[PDB]
Amino acid sequence: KWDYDLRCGEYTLNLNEKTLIMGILNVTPDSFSDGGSYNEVDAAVRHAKEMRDEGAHIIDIGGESTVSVEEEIKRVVPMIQAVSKEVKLPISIDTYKAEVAKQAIEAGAHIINDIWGAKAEPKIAEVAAHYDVPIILMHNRDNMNYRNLMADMIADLYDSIKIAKDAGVRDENIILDPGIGFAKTPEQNLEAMRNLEQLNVLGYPVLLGTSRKSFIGHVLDLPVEERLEGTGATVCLGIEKGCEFVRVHDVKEMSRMAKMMDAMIGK
Amino acid sequence: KWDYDLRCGEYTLNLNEKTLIMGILNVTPDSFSDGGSYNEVDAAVRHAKEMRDEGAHIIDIGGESTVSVEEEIKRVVPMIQAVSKEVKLPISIDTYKAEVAKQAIEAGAHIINDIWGAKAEPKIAEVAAHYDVPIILMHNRDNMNYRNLMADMIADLYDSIKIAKDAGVRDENIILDPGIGFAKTPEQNLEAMRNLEQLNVLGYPVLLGTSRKSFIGHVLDLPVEERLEGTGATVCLGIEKGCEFVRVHDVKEMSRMAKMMDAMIGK
Ligand SMILES: Nc1nc2[nH]c(S)nc2c(=O)[nH]1
């Protein structure tokens, strides 16, 4: 099915063998500094190790979202260094800022993860190309008047691709993300879930990030820490509909669900 | 989609509104009696109440499987009486024996659940007709030389239908079950999972029972009490492939996964 592997400096991610699990690293900044003091970085490393032991294939590390420019680096850079040295797994870096991206890679990060899909700061894609790292382009926008949910997402993603490619990004460094929970009503989220398979016509691996998001809340009527089951359902449907990757919080539980899906669908 | 509801004496199960959850009632027989003493029956009632509070729509109660004839009744009959009076939900009774079935219904049971799909004791289907209760016909056999897994299951189920119908069972009292974990290699289980949608051409609602079964063990390499995630994956794929019902142990967790699936697929 994919005739190529994801190339990540020292690491090689096979796209045909299993749904790949990306572990969300939660950055808890020290209130008493702006930098990379012992507590934030040691907790980060701790968490990264736990996730590695629970089945994660990629550690995702993001500094601002939920900022400054200077601050993003000073807080993101020491964590990539430590997790890099102490955990043997590719790291993605979760930013839409070109500078931030750059520094992150030089610090050891391997994948770029841009929630603005290169629309943010198109320069990001040039960085992407320059280091030859895979870049995840997520669907997003600053409004939500849609002619047609699906047709628009596909158009939009495609607009991100154009930017990536016109910067020198190879098809094989491009991954897409439908951006569930961004720029969509709870209803539009469910519809996208229900039609995720349409992203495949674009020809690129797909990552899904629905972990504990708000729309799961809406359906189950349940707070952020009670969304394991709801997340799991979104994960399963995503694998059945063709996801190469899922970005989750609860790595132990989702690896098990992913691996059971993989066996059943025959990946 | 279904133009009719499941009719269950006092209760009415809608087939279009949600995936219906059937709760497996675990019968722990007192070692010191053969009948319906306080401990077995009170535990049973307790369990049934917990499952009702966690989202179950049907309580499944089975006495021998994992016997005598006389003993099955003496042990199954007092439980149907109590759970009936104390829990306001339809009960299915889990037996392949005509006598047992009969007595169970007279004791308040509403659905018959036959793991031998009327091949066991064809007379069961006559009971079924006589009381006009829905009867679940599960795929099973006493060997596992298959010409073609799927084509054979469909043929076999159909052979059960013939028996049901020739006893007077109305199409609307017929439910089918692919019998995962029965008469199939771990591999054949996965294949059936992967093609469950084929049972729909038969025109009848489908129930899936994969809760904590052995093939989940095989895939995850994990014991019976560590199969929540694996079960969940089988549940999700089943709802996506068209299940009207799932028979599970972990009712809280699966209701949540079912309800998230239902919202996404738009049931
Ligand atoms: N790729 C990706 N990155 C994310 N960062 C946040 S926050 N949410 C997401 C997401 O859903 N997908």
Ligand SMILES: Nc1nc2[nH]c(S)nc2c(=O)[nH]1
């Ligand atoms: N309908 C149904 N009944 C069952 N009884 C047992 S044990 N296992 C099952 C099952 O998988 N399905």
